[PDB]
Symmetry: D2
Subunit: 129 residues, 4 copies
Amino acid sequence: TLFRWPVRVYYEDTAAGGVVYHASYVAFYERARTEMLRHHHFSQQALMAERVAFVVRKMTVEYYAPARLDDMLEIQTEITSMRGTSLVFTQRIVNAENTLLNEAEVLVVCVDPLKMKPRALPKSIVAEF
Amino acid sequence: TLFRWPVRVYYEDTAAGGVVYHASYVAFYERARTEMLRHHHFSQQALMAERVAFVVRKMTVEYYAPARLDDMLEIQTEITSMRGTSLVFTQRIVNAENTLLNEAEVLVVCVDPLKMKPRALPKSIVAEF
Amino acid sequence: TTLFRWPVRVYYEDTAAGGVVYHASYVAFYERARTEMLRHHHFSQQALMAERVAFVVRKMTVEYYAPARLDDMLEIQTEITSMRGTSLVFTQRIVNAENTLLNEAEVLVVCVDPKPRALPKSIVAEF
Amino acid sequence: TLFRWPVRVYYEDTAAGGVVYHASYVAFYERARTEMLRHHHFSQQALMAERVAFVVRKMTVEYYAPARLDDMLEIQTEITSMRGTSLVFTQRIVNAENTLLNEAEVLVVCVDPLKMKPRALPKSIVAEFK
Ligand SMILES: CCCCCC(=O)SCCNC(=O)CCNC(=O)[C@H](O)C(C)(C)COP(=O)(O)OP(=O)(O)OC[C@H]1O[C@@H](n2cnc3c(N)ncnc32)[C@H](O)[C@@H]1OP(=O)(O)O
């Protein structure tokens, strides 16, 4: 089920061309994943209490049009796949005119932050999604 | 042919998990492509002179193992495909023990800096690579 | 008075390997708050673009009293405490959810032509 | 006893105004302090494992002139005070033509990172910087 997250573009996100730096979008996507989990009570507390961390294993981003300084964006996020130890997030960013700026597909793996090796998906997360 | 670029990991690149933040690698890869171009005399000055800029159209990043604070990394970069308006860079990151940490494939489009619309690769770029 | 409040959530991108917010991240947080304060007083950046005005930091002093951490919801507090000629001073501080004072800053900002120009009369009148 | 460190300005460091973002200089200064420690044989990743870390307690930065894309900068760094738990770094940034761009003064405090509580500077670090 879709989760929406608003993001304002600030000077820090821009680059010399007047557009958002392409790596800043990657950070925006991470914020939206974090907020989606937070919304489902999967805070860092609840995660690291039942043995977890989440790390990015593979990420594909396709860039169509730029965001500019002071734009108000919407990050849209869905969990489209769940396996043994991993989830796939399907994400995209639109601007206030609903113009599609870029899209991402993010494979995420559940690990142990001390040693960082694949841990099975907690059943709480599987049932929640 | 392979272009090698060293990158040191600083606090600004790390996050609270104690490893490099996944978006930081995207910036590392960009620096290596910039320095690869610079090695062939395609500086920012030479590119502006021939009315050319490069933008990332699509990027896939594979995260195998973490970099940490104080690691001296080597980014390895090769141009593996050259189309009419487009270049594909294949890149990878190893640490000082030559452990493969990370790999990327980057589709880069040639645009004019005025309209940001695609344009044919400069003949010098085609001839050089 | 001019006191403006702005919330900021701490994300992974803001943290560093020590487990706390990287010290340069606070500098960005303070800039967002100045930007939003100006938006609240009807000086969005596209409006400022139309009046030929930009703002650049000339000098800043930051005091780091206690750290912010991943997932903290912070409040940036911002006041314009002086204005004269071409420049103005922002006084800013950051508190966490317990109202612990984490940080404070004094920022000298100069109005420029996107070179130093006098403050707009509307900006001075507003503050 | 100055320590010099070069830094190339990349597209990631620029902002919409065409110049380096004012917070990027702050990161440049941190890199130079880290490299000064590294030149004197100290690794902050290794020190972390010994429950030793350094945090910024106070910083002043003055911006005189901008850096731009592809500039090769030199960060210049000295330790000007050292006592108890703390060090003062005095730093500046010049460009390739030796134009003074930026200056900073940074009060740094040694802490146990587990508790984020100050501690005496390591004896070997004191020995190293006089
Ligand atoms: C390590 C990874 C990061 C790498 C480098 C970075 O980016 S560094 C990240 C940015 N820097 C920081 O986060 C440092 C934050 N500062 C601190 O944690 C602490 O100030 C610190 C141990 C240096 C110093 O603590 P001290 O109390 O011994 O020093 P000092 O007396 O000067 O502190 C001034 C005021 O701050 C208060 N104070 C100190 N620690 C506090 C805390 N944890 N929670 C609430 N208040 C605190 C003091 O009691 C005092 O309050 P009163 O004046 O009201 O009596």
